[PDB]
Ligand binder design. Structure first.
Ligand code: HEM
Ligand SMILES: Cc1[nH+]ccn1C
Length: 291
């Protein structure tokens, strides 16, 4: 199964920076969603869930096909709540009818990290929409109630190594869990929408408590109002994982650099780039543009 990238006809950098600025400008404007967290965290959850379906053995799933627009995937129980991000992006796709589904779902993910002041993420255009029968079956996304052995094995399928998995997981400092979407709840009072290494610091300095929630599921709670999933608490339980968590809690610049490489690797898995293709784009933020 080969997926070759194909630039939207005649488009260059300047065109994608317009679509970036439209997403960013709506991110600033619709600031009230989810008790003033805004849409940034669910847009990077969407980019991760449309790519997280990839399988390195047969090259099915991944961000290239834009198959999330189809009922089977949009109704995946693992994607409960992400309809909110899709409806956010929908006026923007109407405005730029020429961008493919895959490129828009992954650019929303890039834009959200940079506008929430995380690292720059190089991005590459060219995903092509594919037919409804290429929609991957439900069940390729991870369970939250598990341990380090499960996370390590799950991520081998996206061939992510330990250091890439621990950097990727730092995004769980953003947003919150919602009992009606996943059966987990919290953080309580002040959820975060700035991108920082704070999750690693909290994991190592909070006093955590294994409690059971209103959906009868167990999670780790802290006196301060912070929570963690079983799969998140895994990172201090495993010796290889814990030594990388200590590395990032003590160096926010090495964390930003390593996240940017693993997040771009995640959005690009499964795609073949022709050697005459444009170099990756680095988009300016509204703040660097004075907008
Ligand atoms: C073992 C891996 C993972 C599991 C089990 C998992 C699971 C979850 C769960 C249960 C939620 C709450 C959903 C809800 O109730 O609304 C959540 C949210 C979120 N996750 Fe993950 N996740 C995983 C990996 C990742 C990765 C690798 C990223 C990003 C690169 C990520 C980013 C996010 C973000 C930003 C949210 C917040 C959504 C919001 O505020 O609405 N997750 N995660
Ligand atoms: C701690 C956490 N896990 C998933 C989301 N969040 C905020």
């Amino acid at each position: 199964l080969v997926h070759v990238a194909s630039v939207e006809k005649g488009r260059s950098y300047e065109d994608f920076q317009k679509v970036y600025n439209a997403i960013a400008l709506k991110l600033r404007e619709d600031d009230e969603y989810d008790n003033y967290i805004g849409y940034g965290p669910v847009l990077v959850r969407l980019a991760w869930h449309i790519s997280g379906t990839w399988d390195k053995h047969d090259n099915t799933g991944g961000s290239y096909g834009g198959t999330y627009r189809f009922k089977k995937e949009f109704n995946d129980p693992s994607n409960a709540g992400l309809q909110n991000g899709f409806k956010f992006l929908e006026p923007i796709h109407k405005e730029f009818p020429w961008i493919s589904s895959g490129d828009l779902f992954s650019l929303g993910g890039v834009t959200a990290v940079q506008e929430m002041q995380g690292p720059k993420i190089p991005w590459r255009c060219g995903r092509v929409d594919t037919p409804e029968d290429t929609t991957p079956d439900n069940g390729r996304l991870p369970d939250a109630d598990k341990d380090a052995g499960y996370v390590r094995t799950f991520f081998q399928r996206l061939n992510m190594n330990d250091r890439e998995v621990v950097a990727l997981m730092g995004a769980h400092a953003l947003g919150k869990t919602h009992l009606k979407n996943s059966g987990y709840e919290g953080p309580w009072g002040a959820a975060n929408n700035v991108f920082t290494n704070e999750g690693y610091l909290n994991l190592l300095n909070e006093d955590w408590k294994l409690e059971k929630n209103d959906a009868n599921n167990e999670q780790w709670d802290s006196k301060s109002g912070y929570m963690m999933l079983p799969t998140d608490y895994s990172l201090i339980q495993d010796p290889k994982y814990l030594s990388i968590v200590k590395e990032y809690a003590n160096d926010q610049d090495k964390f930003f650099k390593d996240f940017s490489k693993a997040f771009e690797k995640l959005l690009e898995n499964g795609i073949t780039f022709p050697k005459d293709a444009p170099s990756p784009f680095i988009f300016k933020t509204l703040e660097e543009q004075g907008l």
